[PDB]
Amino acid sequence: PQNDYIERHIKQHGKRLDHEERKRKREARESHKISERAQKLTGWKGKQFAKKRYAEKVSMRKKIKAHEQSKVKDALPTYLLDREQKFSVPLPKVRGISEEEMFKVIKTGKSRSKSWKRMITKHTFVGEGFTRRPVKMERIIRPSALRQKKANVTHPELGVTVFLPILAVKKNPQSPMYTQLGVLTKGTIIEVNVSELGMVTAGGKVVWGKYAQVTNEPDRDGCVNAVLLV
Amino acid sequence: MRVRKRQSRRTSTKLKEGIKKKASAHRKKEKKMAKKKKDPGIPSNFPYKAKILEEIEAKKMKDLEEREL
Amino acid sequence: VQPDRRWFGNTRVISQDALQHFRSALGETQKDTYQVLLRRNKLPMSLLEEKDADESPKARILDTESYADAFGPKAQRKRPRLAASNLEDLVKATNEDITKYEEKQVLDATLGGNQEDKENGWTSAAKEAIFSKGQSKRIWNELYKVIDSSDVVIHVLDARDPLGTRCKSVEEYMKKETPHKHLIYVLNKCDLVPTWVAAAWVKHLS
Amino acid sequence: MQLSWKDIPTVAPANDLLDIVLNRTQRKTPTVIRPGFKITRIRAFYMRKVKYTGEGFVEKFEDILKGFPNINDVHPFHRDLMDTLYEKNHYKISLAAISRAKSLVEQVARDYVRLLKFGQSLFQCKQLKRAALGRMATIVKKLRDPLAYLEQVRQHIGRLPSIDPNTRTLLICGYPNVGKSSFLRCITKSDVDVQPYAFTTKSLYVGHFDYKYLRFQAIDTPGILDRPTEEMNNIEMQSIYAIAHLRSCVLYFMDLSEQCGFTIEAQVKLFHSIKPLFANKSVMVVINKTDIIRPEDLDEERAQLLESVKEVPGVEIMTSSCQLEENVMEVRNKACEKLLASRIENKLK
Amino acid sequence: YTPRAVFKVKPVTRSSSAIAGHGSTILCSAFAPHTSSRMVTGAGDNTARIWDCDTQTPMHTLKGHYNWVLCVSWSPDGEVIATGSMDNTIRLWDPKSGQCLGDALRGHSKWITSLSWEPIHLVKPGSKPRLASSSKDGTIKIWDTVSRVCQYTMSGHTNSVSCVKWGGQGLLYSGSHDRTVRVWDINSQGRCINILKSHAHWVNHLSLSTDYALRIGAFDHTGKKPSTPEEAQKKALENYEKICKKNGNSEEMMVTASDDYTMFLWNPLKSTKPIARMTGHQKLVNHVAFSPDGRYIVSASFDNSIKLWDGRDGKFISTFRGHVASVYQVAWSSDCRLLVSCSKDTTLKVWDVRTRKLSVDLPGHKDEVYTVDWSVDGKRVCSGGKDKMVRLWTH
RNA sequence: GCAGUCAAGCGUUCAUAGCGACAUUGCUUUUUGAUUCUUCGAUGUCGGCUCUUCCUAUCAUACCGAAGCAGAAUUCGGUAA
RNA sequence: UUCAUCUAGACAGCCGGACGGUGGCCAUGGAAGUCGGAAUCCGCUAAGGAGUGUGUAACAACUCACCGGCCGAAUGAACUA
Ligand SMILES: Nc1nc2c(ncn2[C@@H]2O[C@H](COP(=O)(O)OP(=O)(O)OP(=O)(O)O)[C@@H](O)[C@H]2O)c(=O)[nH]1
Ligand SMILES: [Mg+2]
């Protein structure tokens, strides 16, 4: 067999003597077999089937609305067109984190009796000269798996979002110690690079650092999602 | 024809009282959301599809007119 | 978060003349092993960096021939790009291509080989589980523990084979994730290497 | 590999790949965890989910990578063949997209597991599980177009024949409607079209035949029209690259009749035209369709055109009533024999 | 040594009075190619404004349009205003009167992107520079500007023909999203002569080495007011050979921008092959030009760059760091020792080609800027657009 | 996950007060299958002989369905412990 | 429950027409409604799309959407419970 061999075969010999009255009856019977599979098919095959059929009916409704609309009947420049993309902070009143969440304890000794060590459990930001401090003296631990050096921050305008390195953190509600520590819980306002969004004011030298508030717990996921305040 | 286990439909008093508590908290939360008309008129298919609005207009030519005088 | 004029108060602007001033010493700055780096006083990379490349970034074709025109029953293309014209130059290409395929064929024929052994059917055994004594995660753990708890790192080589006991692939990570540690080298057990090689092996690595 | 790659599994479209791998991680892992168990047990539950899903995707992709024939650096004939066939550009860039996606999902898993070993409650870890799995899902959902392309390239290249580049060959070429496939079907066991229309084939068809207890492959090509090497087709550049790379005898097919709907002067024009690709072949042409015309009555310009044919080092104008199967054998033995001289004069150094 | 295109224009530094007007988003503004005062602006609506830079008042606004007008390029006599409008039609005008001259330009199908005119020293002294309008639909209609009807459309491109120019050898230059260049002539009457196939993604901003002069219409380094059309065309051919006689002959260079970064300079007259593989960008390049004295090629792009090349082959000369965003529309000075360039953001950054530095900045809108042109004495620029502010410049 | 567009339909009738499914749009490092010689803190102890049974969320074995499935070999799916 | 059609014959069925200007224009080896892009005209009509699909390498041929002949009474659609 070299090329389109089944098609050469179909044109030379044909199909089964009954491939037409089987296809026809299969079709006419699929209308019955759809309801059978909907009143049977227990347990997550029924969920997949129902969601799939909802998708289908949605698509068909989309299509027929579109066809009847087809039956009824800004101003970018040339160097640009045909290309496609109070003083209230958007987020006061975030929930409060007790000092038992976001502070885990680390008992020390084969006889676990002399703990004195704590471990931050929320995603932090550590800076640029982290360089972990000696084991005998360190009392707060922000483990390396929970660290961040950038944040995925969007813009109110331009309809954009970019990954920007986190320069430093300014305001962490519900503690000043959390701010000194650089813990990135939701609501915190971090000072992030903004070079790529490229803004110039009157005179407008150029800005390469801005303020932005985070809007998702970096624990229910790993990402940091923040939004800019133009 | 192997028959596989069927779920029991008994009580589980722990679960029954849990249902009471869940339902009550849900009602209260509903009342939180609670603290925060195109009347149908006339059904069709009626046989006396003539006399009705006629009687309403017989009323209205009086309810309007017994304001002025 | 109490309302403020910050937060909508811009923070970290920088000037034409500052970019002009500091884009200027990158092709100058006097760095030797007799001077190490301590601080940063961070400066805007995305603007101060990025020397020129003259390589013609690879063209893109996606937005011009999607997929269903490329191949498939749609196949909205029949004639090639760039539709070679010079027949003599083309047969030049194709004959030199077969001969050069023969050149690579003889590269592999000379170097190897394993095809005769795999036609005999046998294969080399399992390299022992002892030959994984340094590449355990229990070990690389403590490794990064000291990389992170260290203010600087000393990568001890041995004098008799530095080129074989470096095998770095860790300095690539170090320079980029924590540049402020400078990877001193000590070529240990030197005496087993005479003073002559004790100079040769440092002269081209310092 | 080589020689009619038919060993590539199947590229399920992106929604089906999502279904397959996710349903698989749902079935072949424990699915009952309770808030009450040790936090170690919860972390382990969700870690295993994420790592397993990652592995599943990675094997689904690694299979495709290790399977596809790797267009560049195989053999110039096949390289240019899949060029003219499946768009070398698109090919390489799609497979590269797949490799990038494989790396991406490995990274997704290897980050979210390092995270999960720090989760502190069933809900935190369940959220991490959903998060990593959803990120892998979009990573794969991106792969709509590459996979839809790869399915058809696979179902095509699988069918695609296998001609050894170096064994004794016999190329058959010329204009449409002349008799390429007539000769092939009449000489060797194959099934190639004969119907009276122009492009009676659309790709390279093969047929083996024996001679001196040895194996000789014969290759019918679609053919070429005028096409001054600027405008061509994927139909024509296949014959182009064939007559280029494959080094054996060639049979140019023309005619002097009412069929073969061009002009004889255009036929010899194309002969002169493809003369540049007749380098090391020792052509034999065939004055064909010689059953009723008795073509000894060809005019003086045809005489001059065959004089031009007799410029090449090794030439042969020969008649053949290609349906009188008792001369097609003389033609086959003649040509292959006059080839064996040069073939062995290579083999003996 | 080197020539000068001899003149001296001081380094521009002054935003003049930023002017209000019709509060929409300007796209393209055209200057009077003889006197250095008059700007015309079809903003983000149907209407069109005319203003002066030296009295800073609305110079008899050119109203009277029903749909969006797009791309305004001035005639070479200061008597005709054809204006790109995205509808299928166009309207003709004149600034001095600012009245309705005729009616629509029927026939087109989508937006009219670039406008061309006759070369000056070529056509009869006392004539009408005809036009070959383009569209988004690949058409090219050659109107005798008086009849404003075309006889023969030539259809080499199937893509969106966005660039039109008429070179001074009776030549043409058309440009479309087909990634390919097609040049015709006048004695064709429905024919294509020069088909150049280079790029893998489409073209943008087909350039010209005669653009400055053959859009000014024979005015000097001082920009007088001539009388005789014969001597005006003399001045045209004279400054022609003043600027284009680099290699002793006026072989019309053609360097067309691209997407694929294949930045290619050409010479259509005596060849089809290209010349200059002057690549190096990272993102899409949009704006390019030849220096007035044809001496170099300037390329500004979407990758924070500015490049000047060898105006003799297309060899690299200089690249000028110092940006944040894309670089849209770039206009030439008269001294040719200086450059202005509109970045994506507010600023309009200015340059130093004589010694290859940045001269200064000039910010002051509070939105995006679009248009940059030049005054016919090398003094002024008008720059309006998305900021709704037609900020005016001077030195 | 975050920031939006939708907009099915719902909302003292309220689309332009409001919501709002399925869809969708944005990177989290690049486009030619390049490498991968980059593994990052489990606060609580883990891992193994003999042995039995149960679940199905099936790897093999049985029987079927759809796949360019020629043959061969698979891929996916159904009943099935 | 809100909507229409219907003996100036409703629904389901058979049977008949489903046409000229016009292989509409581009693109090509062929693309005659049915690989592909751009609108969608008029004519005489009862209707008839510059064509719903199966089909041919290219038309044919079948079909639908659309009309009419036969029959002779409800049927259609969308929501709520
Ligand atoms: N009577 C006769 N007719 C011949 C002879 N040789 C060729 N022909 C004619 O050539 C036709 C053969 O058609 P094909 O072999 O398919 O030629 P083709 O169309 O170029 O074939 P492909 O290139 O594979 O598509 C026959 O039907 C004959 O009409 C011959 O020897 N005698
Ligand atoms: Mg034939």
The Cα–Cα gap between A159 and A85 comes to: 8
As a dihedral over the C-alpha atoms of residue E349, residue E351, residue E357, residue E362, rounded to 10 degrees, the angle is: -30
D160/A contact by beta carbon, under 8 A: yes
Backbone angles phi and psi of B4, in degrees to 5: -110, 155
Short-list E175, E141, E143, CA closest to E159: E175
CA separation for the pair E370, E341 (Å, rounded): 10
3-class DSSP state of A106: strand
Place of tokens 């860790």: C170
Q: What is the 3-state secondary structure (H, E, C) of chain C?
A: CCCCCCCCCCCCECCHHHHHHHCCCCCCCCCCCCCCCCCCCCCCHHHHCCCCCCCCCCCCCCCCCCCCCCCCCCCCCCCCCCCCCCHHHHHHHHHHHHHHHHHHHHHHHHHCCHHHHHHHCCCCCCCCHHHHCCCCHHHHHHHHHHHHHCCCCEEEEECCCHHHHCCCCCHHHHHHHCCCCCCEEEEECCCCCCHHHHHHHHHCCC
Neighbours of D74 (CB within 10 A): 16
Closest CA to E93 of E152, E124, E50, E56: E50
Domain residue spans of chain E:
14-394
Q: Give which of A226, A161, A156 is closest to A188, Cα–Cα.
A: A226
Ligand 1 in contact with D87 (CB < 6 A)? no
Cα separation of the two ends of chain C = 54
Pocket-testing residue among D171, D178, D188, D319, ligand 1, by greatest number of atoms within 8 A of Cβ = D178
Report the residue count for chain C. 206
- DSSP, collapsed to helix, strand or coil, labels residue D268 as helix
Q: What's the half-sphere exposure (Cβ side, CA atoms, 13 Å) at D256? A: 19
Q: What SS3 state is found at D165?
A: coil
Of C4, C11, C149, nearest to A210 by CB-CB distance is: C11
DSSP state, residue A138: -
Q: How far apart are CA D139 and CA D135, in angstroms?
A: 6
Q: How many CB atoms lie within 10 A of CB E177?
A: 20
Q: Tokens 């100058």 label which residue?
A: C28
Q: Are strands E264-266 and E254-258 parallel, antiparallel or unpaired?
A: antiparallel
Q: A-chain residues within 8 Å CB-CB of E70? A: 75, 77-78
Is residue D16 left, alpha or beta, with left meaning phi > 0 and alpha meaning psi from -120 to 50? alpha
Q: Do at least 3 CB pairs under 8 Å connect D with C?
A: yes
C-alpha A160/C-alpha A228 separation (Å) is 10
- Give yes or no for a contact between E27 and E45, defined as CB atoms under 8 angstroms apart: no
Q: What is the DSSP letter of A154?
A: E
Q: How far is CA D347 from CA A132, C97, D340, D344, in A?
A: 72, 21, 10, 4
Closest Cβ opposite residue C8 in set A87, A144, A208: A87
Length of chain E: 395
Token pair 């290209």: residue: E274
How far is the C-alpha of D100 from the C-alpha of D93, rounded, in Å?
10
CA distance D117 to D110: 11
Strand partners, A211: A191
**Mode of pairing for the β-strands spanning E285-290 and E297-301:** antiparallel
Cβ of residue E63 closer than 8 Å to a chain A Cβ: no
* Residue E172 to residue E334: CA distance in whole angstroms: 25
- Amino acid at residue number E225: K
C-alpha C128: how far from chain center: 31
Q: Is the CB of D322 under 6 A from ligand 1?
A: yes
For residue A102, give the nearest of A191, A190, A189, A173 by alpha carbon: A173
Q: Per-residue DSSP letters for A176-220? A: SHHHHHTB--TT-EEEE--GGG----SS---B--EEEEE-S-SSS
- Could you tell me which residues are beta bridge partners of residue A189? A171, A213
Separation CA D119–CA A40 (nearest Å): 40
Q: DSSP character for D176?
A: T
Pairing of strands A150-154, A140-141: unpaired
- Taking residue C142's Cβ as centre, other Cβ atoms within 10 Å add up to 9
Rounded to whole angstroms, the distance from the CA of residue B47 to the C1' of nucleotide G44 is: 49
Report yes or no: E48 and E91 within 8 Å, Cβ to Cβ.
no
Nearest to E374 by CA among E216, E167, E207, E210: E216
**Structure tokens given for E174:** 């058309």
Q: Can you read off the two tokens belonging to residue A71?
A: 């039956």
C-alpha torsion sign, points B2, B5, B6, B10: positive
Residue with tokens 């679960």: B15
Q: How many Å apart are CA D72 and CA B15, to the nearest integer?
A: 67
D36 is in an annotated binding site: no
> What phi, psi does E154 have (nearest 5°)?
-115, 135
Token readout for E128 is 């009408």
Closest CA to D110 of D147, D77, D136: D136
- Asked whether the beta carbons of residue E280 and residue C64 sit closer than 8 angstroms, the reply is no
Whole-number Cα distances in Å, D262 to D179, D226, D256, E206: 13, 10, 10, 43
Strand partners, D208: D217
Torsion of CA E71, E72, E73, E76, to 10 degrees: 160
> Any idea which nucleotide's C1' is nearest the CA of D198?
G29
Phi, psi of E100 (to 5 degrees): -70, 115
How far is it, in rounded angstroms, from Cα C62 to Cα D289? 48
CB contact (8 A) between residue E347 and residue A204: yes
Contact in structure between E91 and E85 (CB atoms under 8 Å): yes
Determine contact: D326 vs chain A, CB below 8 A.
no
> How far apart, in Å, are the Cα atoms of E269 and each of B45, C156, E183, E256?
86, 68, 10, 15
**Which helix (H) or strand (E) segment is D245 a member of?**
helix D236-245
Contacts of A146 in chain D (CB under 8 A): 115, 118
One-letter amino acid at E33 equals P
SS3 at position A164: strand
Per the structure, the residues numbered 56 to 85 in protein chain A that have their CB within 7 angstroms of any atom of strand F are 58, 61, 85
Q: Name the amino acid, one letter, at D187.
A: I
Euclidean distance between CA atoms D199 and D53, whole angstroms: 50
Helix (H) or strand (E) holding A161: strand A161-171
Say yes or no: A44 contacts chain E, CB-CB below 8 A: no
Rounded to the nearest angstrom, the gap between the alpha carbon of residue E232 and the centroid of all alpha carbons in its chain is 21
| Rounded CA separation D150/D156 (Å) | 10
**Resolution value (Å, 1 decimal):** 3.2
Beta bridge partners of A228: A212
Give the number of other Cβ atoms within 10 Å of residue C181's Cβ.
19
- 3-class SS at D325? helix
Question: Which two tokens mark E247?
Answer: 């290699």
Render D22-57 in DSSP notation, one character per residue: HHHHHHSS-----TTS-HHHHHHHHHHHHHHHHHHH
Please state the three-class secondary structure of B16-63 as a single string: HHHHHHHHHHHHHHHHHHHHCCCCCCCCCCCCCCCHHHHHHHHHHHHH
Q: Which residues have CB under 8 Å from C82's CB, separation 6+?
A: E197
E strand or H helix at A58: helix A45-72
Is residue C106 left, alpha or beta, with left meaning phi > 0 and alpha meaning psi from -120 to 50?
Answer: alpha
The amino acid at residue D76 is P
Whether D319 contacts D295, CB under 8 Å? yes
Residue C17 main-chain phi, psi, to 5 deg: -70, -25
Residue at minimum CA to C1' distance from nucleotide G3: B44
Residue D159 dihedral angles phi and psi, to the nearest 5°: -65, -40
Q: Which tokens in the block code for residue E300?
A: 């500004």
The 3 state secondary structure assigned to chain E is: CCCCCCCCCCCCCEECCCECCCCCCCCEEEECCCCCCEEEEECCCCCEEEEECCCCCCCCCCCCCCCCEEEECCCCCCCCEEEEECCCCCCEECCCCCCCECCCCCCCCCCCCCCCCCCCCCCCCCCCCCEEECCCCCCCEEECCCCCCEEEECCCCCCCEEEEECCCCCCCEEEECCCEEEECCCCCCCCCCEEEECCCCCEECCCCCCCCHHHHCCCCCCCCCCCCHHHHHHHHHHHHHHHCCCCCCCCCCEEEEECCCCCEEECCCCCCCCCEECCCCCCCEEEEEECCCCCCEEEEECCCCEEEECCCCCCEEEECCCCCCCEEEEEECCCCCCEEEEECCCCEEEEECCCCEEEECCCCCCCCCCCCCCCCCCCCCEECCCCCCEEEEEC
CB within 8 Å of A113: residues ≥ 6 apart: A107
**DSSP letter at A47?**
H
Ligand 1 atom nearest D184 alpha carbon: 15
- Token pair, residue D54, equals 């990652």
Contact between D278 and D251 (Cβ < 8 Å): no
**Contact in structure between E314 and E297 (CB atoms under 8 Å):** yes
What are the start-end ranges of the H helices in D310-348? 325-347
- Complete edge-to-edge strand list for the sheet that includes strand E131-133: E131-133, E141-143, E150-153
DSSP state letter for D121: S
Q: Which residues lie below 8 Å from residue D240, measured CB to CB, with a gap of 6+?
A: C90, D224, D232, D277
Upstream peptide bond of C82 is cis (omega within 30 degrees of 0): yes
Which helix H or strand E contains D105, and what residues bound it? helix D88-116
CA–CA gap between residue E24 and residue D331 (Å, rounded): 82
**CA D248 distance to own-chain centroid:** 21
For residue C181, give the chain A residue with the closest CA.
A131
Ligand closest in space to the Cα of D201: 1
In terms of C-beta distances under 8 Å and separation of at least 24 residues, what long-range contacts does E272-276 make, across chains too? E272/E194, E272/E195, E272/E196, E274/E196, E274/E198, E275/E313, E275/E314, E276/E309, E276/E310, E276/E313, E276/E314, E276/E315
Residue C75 Cα to ligand 1 middle (Å): 29
Cα separation of C44 and C54, whole Å?
24
DSSP string spanning D194-206?
A: --SSTTS-SS-EE
Q: Is D15 helix (H, G, I), strand (E, B) or coil?
A: helix
Chains that touch C (3 or more CB pairs under 8 A): A, D, E
Cα–Cα–Cα angle for D127, D131, D137, nearest 5°? 145
* Residue from E54, E79, E331 nearest E211 by CA: E331
Whole-angstrom distance, CA of residue A104 vs CA of residue A140: 10
CA distances from C167 to C31, C155, E308 (A): 25, 11, 44
Residues E181/E203, Cβ–Cβ less than 8 Å: yes
D80 Cβ inside 6 Å of ligand 1: no
Residue nearest to atom 6 of ligand 1 (CA): D289
Strand F closer than 7 Å to the CB of D206? no
- By the 8 A CB rule, do E338 and E12 touch? yes
Verify if strand F has an atom below 7 Å from the CB of C167: yes
Q: A53 is written with which tokens?
A: 């059929």
Superfamily of chain region E14-394 = YVTN repeat-like/Quinoprotein amine dehydrogenase (2.130.10.10)
